[PDB]
Design a protein around this ligand. Structure first.
Ligand SMILES: Nc1ncnc2c1ncn2[C@@H]1O[C@H](COP(=O)(O)OP(=O)(O)OP(=O)(O)O)[C@@H](O)[C@H]1O
Ligand SMILES: Nc1ncnc2c1ncn2[C@@H]1O[C@H](COP(=O)(O)OP(=O)(O)O)[C@@H](O)[C@H]1O
Lengths: 434, 412
């Protein structure tokens, strides 16, 4: 099964059809005024009209900022790109800081393409080329459902020859890609010799020929990166690929210009469609003043995605200024370009509901008398700490041969694993020893 | 446990069961290699009422020298590989058949006859079979046809022009016969030199090597029972034998053939356990390489004839694949044939496999229904006087008969 993790219980914003929030729904509780606001952002991203518009989620640690940001990615679903990043990712050793911003801004915009995937497979019954030189090659295929003939071009024939295919081999051709794969010799010939180095496979039991409709997702960034440096062209088989190690590089402005111009051609022809997505720059206060200034340009550009920011700082110093304080750790100049959503601390009853939702997500049975105790301990410590104790408590209940958390299990665990507040009290006492 | 076969029935009749209408009621004679099947045409009755004389085509004459015997009872038989090639051992087989059916009296059989022959018959052989028939027995008119094609004629949906492959498998041969517009396309017809005789011979020799302690207990007439009652044809041989490899399947499916009794007596009066053997005997016609023999077998041959036509008439003649004769009686034969056929056709295309209504008797019933219709079509038959100007190497090209060619044999 899938591993359980820190946000796997949230399944959406869980708003009603009028846009208002429900008390407890889709794996979130509380926060009505703050998560109704995400509803409006989801409508804005689904509208496709806008570019570069941006949002800041603000509020203390453990109040739900990344949970809400991931809830938005659920409401959009896998049709629309959602690129998460951490502020600290900007400091590469291969490229300038603004290049990392610009790559990630491109990643959040997707081309969506359609094609009919078409596959031929089976034992090769014959190969016959077709004047002076090969015009086409006829090939016959067989499976336990029948036989077909195909008419190959000389490019595909070169690929069959490179795979060392001969009659009696079992082959997979994909007609769109021009992909060709040898899968071994057909086992009807497995007695040609007693020992020979080949691997023999049974004749396929599936259809000779299959069709699907498939959808291809690719972002503008993928086009940039693929087209900038020469594509290596090595299906291995070529030792020149060994010498020049890859590295990232500053993509030039001119190339992004041409890529924009070619993609516009294809969305006029109906071959592709465009999905403006979301970039989630989490941990934003870790950006430098240089980068914060470059955002004033990229958020204005009439191509950019929607950008979501989040921060937990009070009035701290802006990185790289050595001096200047500003709200949320973000420069005032940029803070006047974002709409702000505040995020609020939980009352004890809210934490009880979060704890129960985590318990039944994580797979643990818990008695009411024990759940009231984790509720209390959450008010003394923090929600993110009470939710840690569930699994270790279950694991002691299991060692003592019981199915369900009871008071003495959480009480034992509380004495065995400390909180940052109570550990800091120890460090203040034994001060001279560390 | 084994049985023993019956012998010496009581077929005796009056001098001729002549019905109303035309007096010269013909004899219908399936001159088989394993057994002969013979009787009166008996017109005007829809079900053929009495295909009398079901008897093995073998004769006795021993160290005594002075006498011979012919009915179901050291031994001899008149055929070499499904063509008759004996003089008096054919006569005393015909004699038995006529005498038990009744005959008029005078120095000939007064009735015309329809007689089965080999898919191709050597010219000398046809000439001899005509001579040994017109000279000795004095028949007024004669018809030759092929067993398989009579069985097809019987099994057709309608008395109309057709196309198909016939799959046929008798004592010492199997044939694949492509037919178009009612005519055997004998230019590209093919046969395999194996058949149910050779299966029994192989199953004998296997069990002799499995139990040398009692060679004498196992003999052809007991091999017949295990091959008729207890053997089957695989859908795919290398998969069947693979599920036969595990002991828990083996013990549930092996056949316990108790010999007659006089240690629990099996050290000689064994239960002759047949496992894999009950597959390896049927399979000979699909894989003659289980014996020494290098020939294509019923699978590769069908493809090898079917790829020698235009792609439209293939899809025509495969619309009627027909199974008839001897070995097709095995259980599972239709399934193996239609699976093997599915791999060697265009991916979405259609085919049909039909099994004869009674695989062993339909050759005779076919010859009955044919003769009973074509009584007065005097272009179809060879008349007694024609044999005096055409030397016996001569035939009349009706449907369900071998293809004639202009030719003559020197004789003095
Ligand atoms: N309203 C809520 N409903 C359900 N679970 C919540 C809710 N708010 C927070 N959580 C859960 O509690 C934890 C809160 O993480 P949270 O989103 O507060 O991180 P944060 O401190 O805001 O920001 P960061 O991700 O930078 O640490 C997660 O386990 C989250 O899934
Ligand atoms: N019920 C049966 N199951 C299996 N094989 C059978 C069965 N009946 C007959 N045979 C086989 O049929 C063969 C004879 O068929 P037949 O049509 O009489 O031959 P032909 O026309 O060449 O004389 C024999 O080899 C015998 O083993």
């Amino acid at each position: 099964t899938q591993r359980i993790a820190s946000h796997s219980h949230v399944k959406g914003l869980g708003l009603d059809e009028s846009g208002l929030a429900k008390q407890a729904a889709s794996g979130l509780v509380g926060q009505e005024n703050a998560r109704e606001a995400c509803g409006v952002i989801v409508e804005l991203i689904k509208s496709k009209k806008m570019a570069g518009r941006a949002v800041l989620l603000a509020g203390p640690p453990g109040t739900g900022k990344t949970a809400l940001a991931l809830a938005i990615a659920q409401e959009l679903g896998s049709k629309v790109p959602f690129c998460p990043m951490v502020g600290s990712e900007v400091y590469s050793t291969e490229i300038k800081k603004t290049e990392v911003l610009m790559e990630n801004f491109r990643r959040a915009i997707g081309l969506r393409i359609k094609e009919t995937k078409e596959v031929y497979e089976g034992e090769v019954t014959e190969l016959t080329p077709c004047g002076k030189t090969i015009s086409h090659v006829i090939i016959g295929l067989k499976t336990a459902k029948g036989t077909k003939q195909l008419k190959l071009d000389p490019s595909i024939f070169e690929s069959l020859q490179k795979e060392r295919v001969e009659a009696g081999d079992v082959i997979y051709i994909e007609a769109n890609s021009g992909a060709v794969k040898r899968q071994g010799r057909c086992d009807t010939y497995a007695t040609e010799f007693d020992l020979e180095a080949e691997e023999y496979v049974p004749l396929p039991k599936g259809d000779v020929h299959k069709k699907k409709e498939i959808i291809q997702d690719v972002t503008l960034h993928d086009l940039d990166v693929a087209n900038a440096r020469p594509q290596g062209g090595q299906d291995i088989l070529s030792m020149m690929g060994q010498l020049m190690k890859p590295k990232k590089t500053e993509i030039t402005d001119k190339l992004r210009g041409e890529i924009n111009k070619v993609v516009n051609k294809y969305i006029d022809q109906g071959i592709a469609e465009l999905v403006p997505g979301v970039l989630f720059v989490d941990e934003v206060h870790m950006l430098d003043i240089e980068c914060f200034t470059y955002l004033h340009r990229a958020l204005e550009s009439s191509i950019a995605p929607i950008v979501i920011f989040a921060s937990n700082r009070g009035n701290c110093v802006i990185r790289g200024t050595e001096d200047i304080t500003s709200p949320h750790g973000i420069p005032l100049d940029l803070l006047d370009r974002v709409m702000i959503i505040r995020t609020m601390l939980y009352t004890p009853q809210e934490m009880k509901q979060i704890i129960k939702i985590r318990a039944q997500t994580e797979g643990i049975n818990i008695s009411e008398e024990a759940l009231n105790h984790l509720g209390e301990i959450g008010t003394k410590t923090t929600l993110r700490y009470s939710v840690q104790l569930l699994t270790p408590a279950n694991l002691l209940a299991k060692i003592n041969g019981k199915d369900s958390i009871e008071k003495e299990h959480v009480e034992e665990i509380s004495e065995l694993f400390y909180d940052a507040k109570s550990s800091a009290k120890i460090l203040a006492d034994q001060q001279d020893k560390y | 446990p084994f049985r023993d076969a019956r012998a010496a029935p009581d077929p005796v009749l009056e001098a001729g069961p002549v019905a109303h209408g035309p007096l010269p009621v013909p004899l219908v004679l399936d001159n088989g290699s394993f057994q002969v099947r013979a009787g009166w045409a008996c017109p005007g009755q829809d079900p053929g009422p009495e295909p009398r004389l079901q008897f093995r085509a073998v004769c006795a004459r021993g160290r005594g020298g002075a006498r011979g015997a012919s009915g179901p009872q050291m031994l001899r038989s008149p055929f070499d590989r499904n063509v008759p090639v004996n003089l008096e051992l054919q006569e005393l087989l015909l004699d038995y058949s006529f005498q038990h059916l009744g005959v008029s009296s005078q120095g000939c059989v007064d009735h015309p006859i329809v007689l089965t022959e080999a898919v191709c018959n050597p010219l000398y052989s046809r000439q001899m079979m005509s001579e040994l028939l017109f000279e000795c027995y004095g028949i007024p008119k004669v018809a030759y046809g092929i067993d398989s094609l009579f069985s097809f004629y019987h099994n057709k949906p309608k008395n109309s022009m057709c196309s198909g492959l016939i799959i046929s498998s008798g004592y010492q041969c199997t044939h694949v016969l492509p037919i178009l517009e009612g005519r055997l396309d004998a230019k590209n017809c093919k046969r395999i030199n194996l058949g149910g005789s050779q299966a029994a011979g192989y199953l004998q020799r296997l069990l002799q090597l499995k139990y040398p302690g009692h060679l004498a207990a196992i003999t052809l007439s007991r091999m017949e029972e295990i091959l008729h009652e207890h053997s089957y044809i695989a859908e795919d041989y290398v998969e069947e034998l693979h599920k036969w490899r595990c002991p828990d399947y083996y013990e549930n499916n092996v056949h316990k053939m108790q010999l007659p009794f006089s240690v629990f007596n099996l050290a000689a009066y064994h239960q002759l356990f047949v496992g894999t053997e009950r597959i390896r005997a049927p399979e000979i016609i699909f894989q003659p390489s289980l014996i020494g023999e290098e020939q294509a077998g019923i699978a590769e041959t069908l493809q090898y004839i079917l790829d020698r036509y235009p792609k439209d008439i293939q899809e025509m003649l495969v619309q009627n694949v027909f199974l008839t004769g001897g070995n097709t009686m095995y259980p599972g034969m239709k399934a193996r044939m239609e699976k093997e056929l599915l791999e060697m056709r265009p991916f979405r295309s259609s085919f049909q496999v039909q099994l004869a209504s009674n695989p062993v008797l339909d050759a005779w019933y076919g010859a009955r229904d044919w003769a009973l219709n074509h009584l007065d079509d005097n272009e179809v038959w060879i008349t007694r006087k024609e044999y005096e100007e055409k030397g016996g190497e001569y035939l009349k090209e009706h449907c369900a008969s071998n293809i004639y060619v202009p030719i003559r044999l020197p004789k003095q």
